[PDB]
Amino acid sequence: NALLTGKKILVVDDNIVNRRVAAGALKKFGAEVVCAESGQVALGLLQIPHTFDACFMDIQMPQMDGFEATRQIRMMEKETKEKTNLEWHLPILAMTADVIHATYEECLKSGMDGYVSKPFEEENLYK
């Protein structure tokens, strides 16, 4: 697959600037993008059945972080599978750039000169 034409993608992030950046990146490849400012708003949009092909999930959000949002999505999918035999599995990718940048920023602020980086630390994972 070269393009995201015909795909509809949910971007979940409490920071509107991140939502704009992520949306612009995905639309460049043809995606239709819907934004959600919280995990709560996202769970509402993902009530099964829904029309989303993938979701990018911020980690640090107040009230409900991205891990709790994801657990709730997987619980919904598990209930539907058990009640209907239909197996939904929304692709969910974390947006980890924020947490990594914040870690390096605190290293710098504390007075460190740099960091040791192992090959895995800055790679993306699409599993």
Place this chain on the structure above:
Amino acid sequence: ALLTGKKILVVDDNIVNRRVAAGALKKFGAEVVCAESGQVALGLLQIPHTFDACFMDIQMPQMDGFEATRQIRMMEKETKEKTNLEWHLPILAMTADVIHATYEECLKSGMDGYVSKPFEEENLYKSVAKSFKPNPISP
């Protein structure tokens, strides 16, 4: 070898990390001293010391790597104030633990992966400076 003649302090509360870091550095010829905590590291870094660099775990109980680094820098700043001598220990964060833990919780919570290095739109970093008034301009 690459680090022959260098002495390096490894600060990490996990013995396995200390083993791996010291083993790597010795492969390059370095002398390695390990410390299990910030408080131990600060005792070892009383000025003057003989260390050429320090690898600093960020997450440790009682004193984390940021606090330990701030106190090292305070030691160095006081030395400059009192003696005029310049001390600036290279300190590199060991971040693999915190980043591992984040990626692991992504997968444990049920995510299919993560994006730390995103695609960046052509226009993300581009912009034009514009002036309200006409203005000549040169290098």
